[PDB]
Amino acid sequence: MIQQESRLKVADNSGAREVLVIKVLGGSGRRYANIGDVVVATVKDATPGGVVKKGQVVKAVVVRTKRGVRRPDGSYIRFDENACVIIRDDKSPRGTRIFGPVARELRDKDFMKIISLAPEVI
Amino acid sequence: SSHRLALYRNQAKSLLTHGRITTTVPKAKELRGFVDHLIHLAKRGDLHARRLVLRDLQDVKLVRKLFDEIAPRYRDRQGGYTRVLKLAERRRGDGAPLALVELVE
Amino acid sequence: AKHPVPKKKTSKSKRDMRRSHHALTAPNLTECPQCHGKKLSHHICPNCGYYDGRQVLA
Amino acid sequence: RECDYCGTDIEPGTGTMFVHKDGATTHFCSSKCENNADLREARNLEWTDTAR
Amino acid sequence: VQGFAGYKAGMTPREGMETVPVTVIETPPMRAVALRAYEQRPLTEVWTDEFHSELDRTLSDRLDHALDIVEDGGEHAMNIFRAGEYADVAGVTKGKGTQGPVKRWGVQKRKGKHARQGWRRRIGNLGPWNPSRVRSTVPQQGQTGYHQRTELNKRLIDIGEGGPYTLVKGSVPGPDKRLVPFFRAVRPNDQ
RNA sequence: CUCGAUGUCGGCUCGUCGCAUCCUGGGGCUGAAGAAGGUCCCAAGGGUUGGGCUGUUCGCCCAUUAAAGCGGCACGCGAGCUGGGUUCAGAACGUCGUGAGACAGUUCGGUCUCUAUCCGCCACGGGCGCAGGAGGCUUGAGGGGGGCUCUUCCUAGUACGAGAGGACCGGAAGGGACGCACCUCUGGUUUCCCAGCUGUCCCUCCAGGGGCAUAAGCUGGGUAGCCAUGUGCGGAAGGGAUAACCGCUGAAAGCAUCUAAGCGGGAAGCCCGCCCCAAGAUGAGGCCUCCCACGGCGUCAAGCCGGUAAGGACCCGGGAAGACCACCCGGUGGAUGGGCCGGGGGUGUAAGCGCCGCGAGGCGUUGAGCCGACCGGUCCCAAUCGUCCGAGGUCUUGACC
Structure with a gap:
């Protein structure tokens, strides 16, 4: 879910807007970017040059996908949207702030940073 | 589809009239249940039905x-108000083992 | 448009051999219910009407 | 709640909950809630736990 | 009979702690027919009639403990299989039949611009020019649905009697409910 | 060899070898401590990703990765597509030519043909066989499938280390591609199951319907089976024989030497092991459980007849069993179809009357109505009655009662 050139907005403020999905990060084969996962895409467009800027080589992760995530709790969760957050090699966000909620996940795959910044984590 | 029905239709129709017609194996095998089913409704008997x-x-x-007519002559049983009987011969060129069916009586 | 067609006179022999596995097998028919005669195993007829009920003619 | 609102409902002692942006939400239910609700104005909603 | 086996109950999951889906399996003790040994000479299967009532309508642990229940009179309740264990079951494929090299065998078909052209399903090729006619290699529309399928790492979770029946860890019994299931925990790795 | 004709580039798919091995293990080497590289010997198992621009391969570029291999087989594949392209006539430019035409300079567009016979492959039936006639159960020689991997943690930040770093060895967990299987959970189906709808013809006027509006006219939705986006699971242990590679015991060379002989070490690799066939492996295998010697005919009549429901069949009724076939369960002492009946599931409270508003409608009765396969009762219905075929126990030798 979310590869080639599927797009996804920001919720942090890094200075973005939306981003194209190059590679699913992990190792060869692999074909999917599911929240918690980390993506190798770029700017489809970003504010008036906050700090990022349109068409900027990038690194972001998974937190919002209407693909529906099956919670080990035989439960089910999804969103009206599909987007995520940028990052500093060091699985570290940039956006100083968050936006739409997210999912335990993150925690499970490291990121607290946002985990709490988040307005609400579902 | 629209044809499956149609059939059941006219066949169901014609039949009740006579109460035992001449269509091939299947054809009959079905016109039964259905037609059959239908019956069970004449049995219910009312506005709806x-x-x-x-x-x-x-x-x-x-x-x-x-x-009114038949329904009664049946008010008692449990479905089956039809006895689908296969036949001895077969329509020509074809060679289809037709068959006959009636309202078990 | 004959891409593929035989390539060597089929060989009567074989040929027929082919046509070999073929064959008929007389109707398994039985004998009348009381109609007395031979009928299509399971049915009344231009001899019957019976079975258990007179559902026919003659 | 009330499938957020969709007073109908669907899917076992688990169910599921859709969701929108802004820390906003949409716990959820059936294919009669969804679509409709996912495309206009709740108020106006009838059938269910709104125009009850 | 060396083993233990019965038929497919069905599947459903539910409960646990995180939650988990399994499958039900029917089988008390389907009696005990002789037992495997090639002693003094060739020995394998005898038959001192003691079966059902119809059956003539057609008329060293594993096997060992058997001796235990196969001499008892015949039958032999199933379930050593206990709390958290790995037998293995061999279902029966599933009358799926003769299909196109499509699902029968993973393969990409008629692409786009021709991924429709009233075109479609149908393998790509056979053998080159010089190589030589054909291989017994490339499968074919190799029918399915009947295969004597099965698998491994078959972990059983729990069981209870009310009717001797077993609960399973992930179903995939192969064949369908009311189907022929035989289990074992063969050369287990999770051991 | 082919011009009584082998359809040529690249692509697609389906791949199959090979090793000079890209990833992967095992090794010896180093100007190797660690870690990471370099060097070269042994091993092909498995595996070796998305895009871009290019008709291209090639190639450069983008993000990965352990890795992103060299090459075979007419630089595999057109009776399997592709058909861009170079390579029909157009026509263009440029270009030479008095010209006509012209060009491995380019540029637009330009008819890749339904019926496989054989051999061959994948599959399923028919024989005939395996010398009593019989149904049920197993062995597997021998074949086939599958074997890859990243990362995270303790051991440990301990060996090493001036330091920034980073181990063999030993052990957890997750995940990637992949394959077998499977619906429970998830998602896609759902040609009529259920519901709303506009246009129209019959319907009797209203209501309540009906085809058609594809083969459902349109929209919302929807079991059961199939099927992924989803479920289990798998590639492991371990055993034996080795590569390279390392040693021991010790000659011939009274001193040394892995060495001919003697004994061990050591690999994702071979053999085995794990699944999947499978004796038509003519060496027709094992075993248990049934059937008993019938008739008359010239003969080693191992030839013609009733048989033995042991037994099977055919015909019927049925199956995620299925092209046909073969294969499975049932054949009224039946629950096998349908039928009905409860049950679930599904559609969203019906037809009618009722009560509010001129009307449109609403609110009620009423979670109604209607229900396609899903779970299970009940002989309403329909599997009646009937046939056919089937054994007898081949020759020698001996071992025991």
Whole structure:
């Protein structure tokens, strides 16, 4: 879910807007970017040059996908949207702030940073 | 589809009229259940029931004829109001093992 | 448009051999219910009407 | 709640909950809630736990 | 009979702690027919009639403990299989039949611009020019649905009697409910 | 060899070898401590990703990765597509030519043909066989499938280390591609199951319907089976024989030497092991459980007849069993179809009357109505009655009662 050139907005403020999905990060084969996962895409467009800027080589992760995530709790969760957050090699966000909620996940795959910044984590 | 029905239709129709026609194996095997089913409705017997049965058959005369007429002659049993009997011969060129079916009586 | 067609006179022999596995097998028919005669195993007829019920003619 | 609102409902002692942006939400239910609700104005909603 | 086996109950999951889906399996003790040994000479299967009532309508641990229940009179309740264990079951494929090299065998078909052209399903090729006619290699529309399928790492979770029946860890019994299931925990790795 | 004709580039798919091995293990080497590289010997198992621009391969570029291999087989594949392209006539430019035409300079567009016979492959039936006639159960020689991997943690930040770093060895967990299987959970189906709808013809006027509006006219939705986006699971242990590679015991060379002989070490690799066939492996295998010697005919009559429901069949009724076939369960002492009946599931409270508003409608009765296969009762219905075929126990030798 979310590869080639599927797009996804920001919720942090890094200075973005939306981003194209190059590679699913992990190792060869692999074909999917599911929240918690980390993506190798770029700017489809970003504010008036906050700090990022349109068409900027990038690194972001998974937190919002209407693909529906099956919670080990035989439960089910999804969103009206599909987007995520940028990052500093060091699985570290940039956006100083968050936006739409997210999912335990993150925690499970490291990121607290946002985990709490988040307005609400579902 | 629209044809499956149609059939069941006219066949269900014609039949009730005579109560045992001549169509091939299957054809019959089905016109049964259905037609059959229908019956079970003449049995229910009422506003509704009728409003259905007819719904398909389309035709006072009968529709009523059965609901009242036959229906009764059956009010007792448990489905099966039909005895699908295969036949000895077969329509030519073809070679289809037709068959006959009636309202078990 | 004959892409593929035989390539060597089929060989009567074989040929027929082919046509070999073929063959008929007389109707398994039985004998009348009381109709007395031979009928299509399971059915009344231009001899019957019976079975258990007179559902026919003659 | 009330499938957020969709007073109908669907899917076992678990169910599921859709969701929108802004820390906003949409716990959820059936294919009669969804679509409709996912495309206009709740108020106006009838059938269910709104225009009850 | 060396083993233990019966038929497919069905599947459903539910409960646990995180939650988990399994499958039900029917089988008390389907009696005990002789037992495997090639002693003094060739020995394998005898038959001192003691079966059902119809059956003539057609008329060293594993096997060992058997001796235990196969001499008892015949039958032999199933379930050593206990709390958290790995037998293995061999279902029966599933009358799926003769299909196109499509699902029968993973393969990409008629692409786009021709991924429709009233075109479609149908393998790509056979053998080159010089190589030589054909291989017994490339499968074919190799029918399915009947295969004597099965698998491994078959972990059983729990069981209870009310009717001797077993609960399973992930179903995939192969064949369908009311189907022929035989289990074992063969050369287990999770051991 | 082919011009009584082998359809040529690249692509697609389906791949199959090979090793000079890209990833992967095992090794010896180093100007190797660690870690990471370099060097070269042994091993092909498995595996070796998305895009871009290019008709291209090639190639450069983008993000990965352990890795992103060299090459075979007419630089595999057109009776399997592709058909861009170079390579029909157009026509263009440029270009030479008095010209006509012209060009491995380019540029637009330009008819890749339904019926496989054989051999061959994948599959399923028919024989005939395996010398009593019989149904049920197993062995597997021998074949086939599958074997890859990243990362995270303790051991440990301990060996090493001036330091920034980073181990063999030993052990957890997750995940990637992949394959077998499977619906429970999830998602896609759902040609009529259920519901709303506009246009129209019959319907009797209203209501309540009906085809058609594809083969459903349109829209919302929807079991059961199939099927992924989803479920289990798998590639492991371990055993034996080795590569390279390392040693021991010790000659011939009274001193040394892995060495000919003697004994061990050591690999994702071979053999085995794990699944999947499978004796038509003519060496027709094992075993248990049934059937008993019938008739008359010239003969080693191992030839013609009733048989033995042991037994099977055919015909019927049925199956995620299925092209046909073969294969499975049932054949009224039946629950096998349908039928009905409860049950679930599904559609969203019906037809009618009722009560509010001129009307449109609403609110009620009423979670109604209607229900396609899903779970299970009940002989309403329909599997009646009937046939056919089937054994007898081949020759020698001996071992025991």
